[PDB]
Ligand binder design. Structure first.
Ligand SMILES: COc1cc2c(Nc3ccc(NC(=O)c4ccccc4)cc3)nc(Cc3ccccc3)nc2cc1O
Ligand SMILES: COc1cc2c(Nc3ccc(NC(=O)c4ccccc4)cc3)nc(Cc3ccccc3)nc2cc1O
Ligand SMILES: COc1cc2c(Nc3ccc(NC(=O)c4ccccc4)cc3)nc(Cc3ccccc3)nc2cc1O
Ligand SMILES: [Mg+2]
Ligand SMILES: [Mg+2]
Lengths: 450, 450, 450
C-alpha cells in the first residue's frame, strides 16, 4: 500500500532567539526538518507535504533541492487545520503519516512498525510511556484499542496515573483524513482545530484506533530552545557512537566523538578522543586517528595514521601515508601511498606522489609533486603580484632545499636538486643542480651588546 | 534595612595538599572566596568582614584590592568565636549574613530570600533537604519555626529520619549577634564555641527562628579536597552553559564548554566543542567559533568566523574577519573589518587594516599594516641584535612577497611591491618595486646520490 | 603460603570484529591481559600460567617479554578443562588464583582479601551483588558458607531473588585443584567441563567454600565488544583521575583527562581540560599544563608552564621553562632551565642550554645549542642531499637572525652574531659577525595591477 507524509514545519521558535525559523537549526550538521524529510524518504514516501510558514523565504533558500510539496500556512489555526491544507493532495488510497519538523529523531524502524499496526479504515497512534506524564494527553484503552485522549486538565484521579501518553504522530488512509478533518471543530480554550479529535471522530464512526509504543522517548521529543536541542544532539551522537562501536570501530571515548554526516569504515579503525567527522568520510582498514583531528569529506586509505590536531577537508590520502601532527589539508589535496606530511604544513589543491615527504613549516599550493621527492623545511610555493594562482610542477626524485621559494608558473624536472635558500623563477631541467651563490660580510671580534 | 556580611575564610585546607590556603583555590578561574565576596557585594553589603588565618600573607597578596575588613583569627575556637571577632564592627541595626569562603556557589537569589524571611529580632536559617542526611544536624520545627538543631549523635530514631538539615548560613541583626555570641559556651566533645547554639539562645530568649530552604544542595556544598572542588566546577560550568543556551547561544556540547569570566553575546552565536572563554569576552551577532579555540579578553565583531585551534588574547577583531585554523593572536593584536589571518600565523601587538590578508607561516610583531595589503607566506618582522622591539610600518595596498624579512625600524609606503625572498632594511617609497637579484650556479647532469 | 595464578586468555572475541584476539585490545594503552598479568605479579604470584589459543602467534609476538608459562588450548571444552591444562604445574602446596584475561580491572586489594578468606583445603569464591541478577549463577549459602551455584534456568521463584552472583574468580590450593578437576564431568546442555562444579565437588568432599564480595561490579566485568571495552575505559580513567585529585593534583575536568601509563607528580600541579599523559611521565612542583597537551615519556621540572596544544615525547624539560602554545618536542629534545619554546616550533634530538629562546616558526634538529642564545623566527637546521643527519653545534650567547638556514655539519662558536636571511655553511668563529650582502633592484613609480 502506497505511502505519503505530512511534516509540520511552520513554527517561529521564538525561544531559540534566532533569525532562523525553528526547524532549520541543526542536529549533527543537518537541519532538524531534513532529518524528518530523509526519514520520510527512507520509509518510501511518494509525496512529502511540507507545511511551512514562519521564515518562509529562508526555508525555501535552505531546502531548495528537497523533493517536497510546499504548502504555505498563513495563520495558526491548529494541527488539524495545518494537515487539511495538504489533504486535497492525499490519495484516497495510500497511507498518510503525520510528523513534526521540530521532533527530528523519529526512526524509520518505529514508523514502519506504526504503519504495520494500522487497521484498515482506522488510525495507528504512536504513544510513549513517561514516569511523570504531567502535561501530556493520556491514552485511554478499551480494551487494547484507543477510545480517547484525555488532556491533563480533564483527567480524573485514576486517569492522571495513566503513564501512556499521546505523541502526536499518527497514520491513517487519505480518504479517512479528508473525511474526519472536515468534521473537526474548535470549541476549546485555545480555539484551534486539534488533530487529537480524530481519535474521537474515528470511534464515533465505529473505526478502530490502535496504539503503538515508541522505543525511546527521545525519538518523540521536540526542541523548543537550544538547551533542548543540545540534549537531542548528545543523545543522537551517543547512539551513532554506540553503533560504530558494536560494528568494531574503537572509539576511545564515545562521549568525546562527533559524527556530522556519514562514515564508512574498514576493520581495526582506532579513533582517539575529540575527533570530529563531517560530511562523507571513508576510512580503510587499520586507520588510526589521533586526538583533536577534524576530517570533512575525505577518503583515507588502509593503514594510514593521522597524528594529533590535523584538519583535513575535501582530500584523498593513499595507503600507508602518515599525516600530522598539526597538518592541514585543504580542498584538492591528493596524497599518494606512503607519503609523509608533518607539522605546520599546509597543502592546498595539490597532488603529491608516492613516497614523497613534506615534513615542516611548508606551504604547497596549486602544485603537482612527483614520487620520492624531498620537500625541505620552510619551502613555499608562491605567485607574482597580479597573478591568478598558477601552477608549480615538480617531477620525480627531486630534492628541494630548505627555505626555498618556488615562484609559479614553474617546472622542475626529474632528478633535479635545489639547494637551500634558493628563489626559483625559471624552469629547472632534468638532473640539474641549482645552488644559490651568497655574498656575506664577516667582521671579526664583534662584541655583542650584552 | 542595611546589610553587612561575615565570611569565614581561616581554614588550612590540609586535604588539598597545597601551599595555598583553602579558599584561594579557583572555580572558573576565580578564587572560591572571591565568589562569596562578589555575591556579598551583589546583595548590597556595606561591610564585608573577612575572617582569615592560615596562609595570611598569601590571602593579603591575592586579595589585596578587595573591599573587605581584615579580621585575623589566631586560634581555632569555633564558628561562634570567629564571628565574634567581627562583632564589634556590627551596627546594632543592620542585618548580618554569615557565609563560608569554602562554599562558593551560594547565590544572591537564595540569600535575598533568606534575608526577607528574617523576623524582627530573630534569626533566618538556611536549610537543605538531603536524601541521606547522615552526619548533618537536623532541623526540628514547632510549628514551622526552628526550635533546635539536633546533631547526628544526639538524635532519636524518628529525628534521624528528618531529611532537612542545617547549612551553617544564617541572618540576624547586629544587636542580636553581639548579645547571643557573648552567651555561647563550649561544653561539648570538641571544646569549641558553636554558632549553632544561637538557635537555642534565640528560643531561650523567646525570639523567632525561621527556616528557608536552598534551591540546590550544590550551592551550600564546600570543597575540602580537589575532587570536591572539581565537582563544584562541573556543576557551575553546566549552569553557566544552560543559561547561555536559554539565551540563544548555540553551544554544541555544554559538557565541553568552559567560561572562566564574563561573556557578552549577540544572537545566532555558534560555539563548537572544547572552547574556553576567559576574562571578559564580547561576541557580536553570528560569530562562529570552531573546535578547540581559546578566547581570553577579546572583542569579536559581527559575522566573524574563528576556525579550529585558534588562541586569542587581549585582542580586537572587526566585523566579517576570518581567523584560523591554527592562528595565534597575542596581546595588542587589532584586526580591522574583513581581514584574514590563516594557519601558523602569529600576530603580536599590531594593527592590521581593512581587507588585508596574512594567511600562512608568518610572524607580525610591533607593526602597523594598512588596508588591502597582501602579506605573503613566510614573512617575518624582526629586529637588530641589541634593539628594543622597534616598529614596522606598512601602508595601504602593499604587496609583500613570500619569505621576506622586514627589519625594524622600517617603513613601507602605500602601493609598494616587495618581491619574494627579500631582506628589507631601508624605507620603501610610494609605488616602489623592490626585487632581490639572485646569483645562482647551475650544474647540468648532476646525478643525485640515489 | 606461596601463590601462583592461572589466566584464561584463549577466546577469539568474534564480536570485536578484529584481527586481534580478544585480550590484546587495550585499556589505558595496555592490553587487557597485561592488566591481569601485572595484577597477578603485584599479588606475588610465583608462576603465571597463561591459557592461550586463538590469535596464538599474535599473543606470542605482543606478550613476548612477559614472565608467563605458555599453555596452549587447542579446543574449547570449558573452563575446568582449560585450568586442568595448567594443573600439572601446580604445587600441591601453594594457592592458585583463577582469573580472566578479558576482565582486566580486578584489583590486587580485592584479590588479597579473597586469598585471606580461603579456608585450609577449601575454596574462596569471589561474588558480587547485582540489582538485576538475571542470567548469572546465584550463590546459595548455608549458613555463611557456599553450598551451590544455581544457574538462571534451574532456580526456583525465591532463588531468582538472590542478588548475590558468581564471578568465576576462585582461589584454592594446588593439591585440591588437581583432585577436583579430574572429577569434573560435562553432562549439561553445552557439553563442557565447568569450573563451577568445584563448588559441588568441594561440599561433596566435606570441604568449606567461603564467599568474598567484590568492591565494585566493574572490577569483574568483561568486555565482549568495543562498546563494553569503552565503558571499562571510562570507569578506569575516572578512578585514576579521582586518585590523582585526592593526592592534590588539580585536574580541572576529570571526565576530560586520560592517563595511559604512570604519572609521578609534585604538589600544586594544574592540568587543564583534554590532556593526555602517556608512558612514564614525571612532573615537578607547580607545573601547569594547558588545554590539549599530549605528554608521552617526559620529565618536566619544577615551575614549568606548558601552554595549549603542545605535543611532547621522549623529552626532558628543566625548571622554569616555558613551552607553547603549538610547540612540538620530538624524541631526544633536552631543554635546560629557563628556556623558551614558542608557537610553530619543532625541536628534534637536540639540547638547548639555559635561558635560550626559540620562539617562532623554527625547526631545530640534531643540534646542540648553548646558554642564552636567541634563535630567531624562521630559522631552520638542515642537511645536504645524500647526508646522514649531521650535527649543528651552536655555542653560548649566540644571536641567530630570522630566517637563517644552518647547514649541517657546522659549528657556530661563542658570542657570534648571524644576521637575518643568511645561509650558513662554514664554521663561524668566536665573536664573529656574519651579515648577508643583498643585491636589490628598485623600480620607482611601479603601479600595482589593482
Ligand atoms: C515546528 O512546526 C510545528 C511543530 C508542531 C509541534 N511539534 C511537536 C509535536 C510533538 C512533540 N512531541 C510531544 O508532544 C511529546 C514529547 C515528549 C513526550 C511525549 C510527547 C514535539 C513537538 N506540535 C504541535 C502540536 C502538538 C502538541 C502536542 C502534541 C502533539 C502535537 N504543533 C506544531 C506545529 C508546527 O507548525
Ligand atoms: C574555610 O574557612 C572556614 C570554613 C568553615 C566551614 N565551611 C563550610 C561550612 C558549611 C558547609 N556546608 C555544609 O555544612 C553542608 C554541606 C552540604 C549539605 C549540608 C550542609 C561547607 C563548608 N564550616 C565551618 C563549620 C561548620 C560545619 C558544619 C556546618 C556549618 C559550619 N567552619 C569553617 C571555618 C572556616 O575558617
Ligand atoms: C578470554 O579468554 C577467556 C575468557 C573467559 C571468560 N571471561 C569472563 C569471565 C567472567 C566474567 N565476569 C562475569 O561473569 C561477571 C560479570 C559481571 C557480573 C558478574 C559476573 C567476564 C568474562 N569466561 C569464561 C566462562 C565464564 C562465564 C561466566 C562466569 C565465569 C566464567 N570462559 C572464558 C574463557 C576464555 O578463554
Ligand atoms: Mg622562511
Ligand atoms: Mg628565506
Amino acid at each position: 500500500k502506497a505511502l505519503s507524509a505530512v511534516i509540520l514545519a511552520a513554527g517561529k521558535g521564538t525561544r531559540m532567539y534566532s533569525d532562523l525559523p525553528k526547524v532549520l537549526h541543526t542536529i549533527a550538521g543537518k537541519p532538524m526538518v531534513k532529518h524528518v524529510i530523509d526519514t520520510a524518504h527512507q520509509l518510501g514516501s511518494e509525496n512529502i507535504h511540507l507545511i511551512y510558514g514562519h521564515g518562509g523565504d529562508l526555508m525555501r533558500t535552505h531546502l531548495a533541492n528537497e523533493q517536497v510539496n510546499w504548502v504555505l500556512q498563513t495563520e495558526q489555526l491548529g494541527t488539524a487545520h495545518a494537515v487539511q491544507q495538504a489533504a486535497p493532495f492525499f490519495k484516497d488510497n495510500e497511507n498518510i503519516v503525520v510528523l513534526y519538523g521540530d521532533a527530528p529523531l523519529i526512526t524509520k524502524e518505529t514508523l514502519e512498525k506504526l504503519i504495520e499496526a494500522k487497521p484498515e479504515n482506522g488510525i495507528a497512534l504512536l504513544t510513549v510511556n513517561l514516569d511523570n506524564p504531567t502535561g501530556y494527553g493520556r491514552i485511554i484503552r478499551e480494551n487494547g484499542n484507543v477510545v480517547a485522549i484525555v488532556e491533563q486538565k480533564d483527567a480524573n484521579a485514576e486517569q492522571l496515573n495513566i503513564k501512556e501518553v499521546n505523541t502526536g504522530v499518527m497514520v491513517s488512509d487519505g480518504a479517512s483524513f479528508k473525511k474526519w478533518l472536515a468534521r473537526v471543530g474548535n470549541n476549546n480554550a485555545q480555539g484551534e482545530y486539534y488533530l487529537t479529535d480524530l481519535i474521537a471522530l474515528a470511534n464515533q464512526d465505529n473505526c478502530q484506533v490502535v496504539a503503538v509504543q515508541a522505543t525511546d522517548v527521545m525519538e518523540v521529543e521536540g526542541a523548543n530552545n537550544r538547551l533542548q536541542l543540545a540534549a537531542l544532539e548528545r543523545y543522537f551522537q551517543n547512539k551513532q557512537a554506540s553503533k560504530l562501536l558494536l560494528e568494531g570501530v574503537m572509539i576511545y571515548d564515545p562521549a568525546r566523538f562527533d559524527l556530522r554526516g556519514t562514515l564508512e569504515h574498514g576493520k581495526d579503525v582506532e579513533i582517539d578522543v575529540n575527533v570530529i567527522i563531517e560530511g562523507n568520510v571513508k576510512l580503510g582498514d587499520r586507520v588510526k586517528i589521533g586526538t583533536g583531528c577534524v576530517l570533512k569529506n575525505v577518503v583515507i586509505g588502509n593503514d594510514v595514521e593521522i597524528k594529533p590536531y590535523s584538519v583535513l577537508e575535501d582530500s584523498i590520502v593513499g595507503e600507508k601515508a602518515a599525516i600530522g601532527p598539526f597538518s592541514r589539508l585543504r580542498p584538492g589535496a591528493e596524497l599518494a601511498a606512503e607519503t609523509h606530511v608533518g607539522n605546520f604544513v599546509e597543502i592546498k589543491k595539490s597532488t603529491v606522489g608516492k613516497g614523497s615527504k613534506v615534513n615542516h613549516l611548508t606551504y604547497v599550493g596549486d602544485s603537482e609533486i612527483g614520487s620520492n621527492c624531498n620537500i625541505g623545511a620552510g619551502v613555499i610555493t608562491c605567485n607574482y603580484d597580479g597573478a591568478n594562482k598558477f601552477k608549480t610542477i615538480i617531477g620525480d626524485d627531486v630534492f628541494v632545499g630548505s627555505d626555498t621559494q618556488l615562484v609559479a608558473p614553474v617546472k622542475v624536472a626529474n632528478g633535479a636538486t635545489i639547494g637551500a635558500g634558493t628563489t626559483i623563477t625559471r624552469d629547472v631541467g632534468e638532473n640539474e643542480l641549482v645552488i644559490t651563490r651568497v655574498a656575506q660580510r664577516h667582521i671579526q671580534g664583534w662584541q655583542r651588546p650584552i
